Design a protein around this nucleic acid. Structure first.
Ligand SMILES: [Mg+2]
Lengths: 75, 82, 89, 67, 69
RNA sequence: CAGCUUUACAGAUCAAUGGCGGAGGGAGGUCAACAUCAAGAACUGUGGGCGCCUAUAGAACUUAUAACGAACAUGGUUCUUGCCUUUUACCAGAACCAUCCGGGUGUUGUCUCCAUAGAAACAGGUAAAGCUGUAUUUUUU
């Protein structure tokens, strides 16, 4: 068994290709690699990229995204 | 403890209906319930908001999404109230 | 066998301070002392039979109970030829 | 007036409690309802005549039924 | 504190209904008190997979349906 | 400590309305009378559907090592015995039955000793009694 806290600790140490979907949001996705972790689901992401959905690679950098509006993570 | 949530968990086993925030109704045997209404069903018909019925074996739901739950007429009788 | 009115006797002796019990789930059988197949075997008619006489008494008495033995005087023994090899030669 | 501090005053009366309106029904003298310590006193006093056998087992093969 | 009893659904594929009519197929890996589903990623709704191992947030869950019996 | 609800206050307008009203004692008594207490574990009423079935209210007392009594007599009839031999009187067992000494409640009434008010709330305040109260994923940030 793996709780989300432990799977994100794998994503923390690895820093492998993450793709993030967003809460109350279908129009945009993110593509980066997990760098931080809070006690809440707040995670800072370096090498992040704004990726509009397959209904292109748009510009985005390193971001502290407020993690209460997360949907997906996959490193 | 929540006296409506009390009723829900007491209603386990009966053929109960369930509509969510999405408006998609359900109907079948209940299995599990908790403080946060983490509902499970068996033999559940799953009518989409348009009316498209899809019969399925089971389902699990999160309490935040739940709107209202149709309980039978048996829980009217006893024994939660007095 | 020896157990009969054991609870009661114990209670009596103990002045009702000895709530005793008996039971049989182990199925722990054991040899009755004394050896089956003896002629004289025992002493008493009324009194409880001795330790070394016991098995024989139990057998003959039980045969009587079960109606196998003929009258009062009888014996449990082999129904085979050769005079039982002249009684073990 | 120390061990027998409560009953001593009334233990020797025609009707043990003529008044004592709390402890008995009244003067009809039908019912009673003592407090604890006086009951204790009564018990202690009754040591010679009291039943004095708590182990209900004791009457084994000596009950009315047994008889 | 009340742990949602997903040990009946542990190591089984599940059709997770999530925000905006989106679906997630995938075998279950674990969970927490917030219902955040740790699962092996599968094809997302014709159909196409994003990621290998995923962690879905509880707030975004609409439902989760027993694909496997 | 805050909210609500209840009571004793002071005066209130006293509408609003309630409710305690076409408001009416208590404690006892070697005091009565009445009912009634061994029965499918057992009682009674109420409706309804045809003496009964079916839902509804109720039910003091006495009990499950079974009994109103944590107690204990007596009398009768038979049947059996004993002492005997003739009966009473008796022995002590049985089965039946009765009598008696008492008991319980419930209801009436009387007898006694104490009593002895025909109106208080609302707006609050004072004080006291009954509950609740002290955002970062499923309730409300
Ligand atoms: Mg004559």
């Amino acid at each position: 068994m793996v709780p989300p806290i432990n799977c994100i600790f794998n994503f923390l140490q690895q820093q492998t290709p993450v793709t993030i979907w967003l809460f109350e949001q279908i129009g945009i996705r993110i593509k980066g690699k997990i760098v931080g972790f809070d006690e809440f689901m707040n995670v800072v992401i370096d090498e992040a990229v704004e990726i509009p959905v397959n209904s292109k690679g748009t510009p985005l950098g390193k971001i502290l995204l407020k993690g209460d509006n997360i949907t997906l993570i996959t490193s | 403890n929540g006296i409506p949530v009390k009723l829900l968990n007491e209603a386990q086993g009966h053929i109960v209906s369930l509509e969510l925030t999405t408006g998609a109704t359900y109907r079948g045997k209940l299995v599990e319930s908790e403080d946060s209404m983490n509902v499970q069903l068996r033999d559940v018909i799953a009518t989409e908001p348009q009316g498209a019925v899809t019969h399925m074996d089971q389902i699990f739901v999160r309490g935040s999404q739940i709107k209202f739950i149709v309980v039978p007429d048996l829980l009217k009788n006893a024994p939660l109230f007095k | 066998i020896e157990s009969a009115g054991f609870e009661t006797d114990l209670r009596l002796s103990t002045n009702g301070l000895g709530m005793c019990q008996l039971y049989f789930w182990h199925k722990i059988w054991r040899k009755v002392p004394g050896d089956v197949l003896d002629k004289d075997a025992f002493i008493p008619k009324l009194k409880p039979a001795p330790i070394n006489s016991l098995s024989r008494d139990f057998v003959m008495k039980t045969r009587r109970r079960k109606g196998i033995s003929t009258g009062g005087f009888m014996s449990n023994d082999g129904p085979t030829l050769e005079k039982y090899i002249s009684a073990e030669l | 007036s120390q061990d027998d501090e409560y009953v001593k005053d009334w233990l020797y009366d025609s009707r043990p409690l003529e008044e004592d309106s709390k402890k008995v029904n009244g003067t009809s003298y039908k019912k009673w309802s003592f407090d604890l310590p006086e009951m204790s006193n009564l018990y202690r006093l009754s040591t010679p005549l009291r039943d004095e056998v708590t182990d209900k087992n004791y009457y084994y093969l000596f009950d009315k039924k047994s008889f | 504190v009340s742990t949602p009893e997903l040990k009946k659904y542990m190591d089984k594929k599940i059709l997770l209904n999530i925000n905006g009519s989106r679906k997630v197929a995938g075998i279950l890996r674990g969970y927490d008190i917030f219902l955040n589903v740790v699962l092996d990623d599968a094809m997302e709704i014709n159909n196409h997979q994003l990621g290998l191992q995923t962690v879905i947030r509880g707030n975004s869950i609409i439902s989760l349906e027993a694909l496997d019996a």
